[PDB]
């Protein structure tokens, strides 16, 4: 028994309070660059249960639950390489920034 | 310093609202099948601090904090192989379903 | 596409209710010992974005969002080896205890 049961879906909450980042926005981009700038964004893909990938546009939307959603349904998002990640709340206020996901 | 401190205990919350799947139920089963059906379920074990494993019955119960619990105490659950996972709230409504935890 | 976007910062919540362990404390110690006892604690370091590590004193503080904070800012904590971890709420009541993070 090596496979531990847990929750695989990521949840994004505030950094100064216990609240989901409801209607927030996540920008994915080049390692150590501001992903909010369109020129720094990288391709993001939805990985279907099928195993296929459908590239979508940014930013990614975080629903009321703090989970990324596309077309009203929870999705798994993946990129080809490491990336920087900036999370903004519904009011365009920056919640968090991870320069290099791969190093964190 | 390569060991980063984190929270190893999984937490299960609702998919459309920021709440715990309080008193919900988790079914673990064959990859890509409906775990709710007893014919698709696979063994689930509590992994004790001891390293020992004690097989328990399904479904797994989620307490009010959104954590799996057994005998009134937080427990770590493991399976031998990959599995599909379906989460239901206290009212029998499906919260989420991951057909293959390994791929996710 | 193998890099999945997720939330990398750990969040600490209560075990009997869906709340953040606001202003709680985390003790890191020798595997299978009470980390609250200083004799059992191991060194803990903040890993800065820079890649540098600065040792800090224990216990680690959890803010209102249930996130580890130091000097008022969210930090990434790392240690040298596996460890036991005890989490306590603002009232000194124990919330959780993981004897060996490496096994869990």
UniProtKB/Swiss-Prot annotation, chains A, B, C:
It is found in: Virion. Homotrimer. Interacts with the host O-antigen lipopolysaccharides; this interaction induces cleavage of host O-antigen. Interacts with tail hub protein gp10; this interaction anchors 6 fibers onto the tail hub hexamer. Structural component of the short non-contractile tail. The tail comprises six spikes that mediate primary attachment to the host cell lipopolysaccharides (LPS) and display endorhamnosidase enzymatic activity, hydrolyzing the alpha-1,3-O-glycosidic linkage between rhamnose and galactose of the O-antigen polysaccharide. Digestion of the LPS brings the capsid near the cell outer membrane. The interdigitation of the polypeptide chains at the C-termini is important to protrimer formation in the folding pathway and to thermostability of the mature protein. Belongs to the P22likevirus tail fiber protein family. This is Tail spike protein. The lineage of its organism: Viruses, Duplodnaviria, Heunggongvirae, Uroviricota, Caudoviricetes.
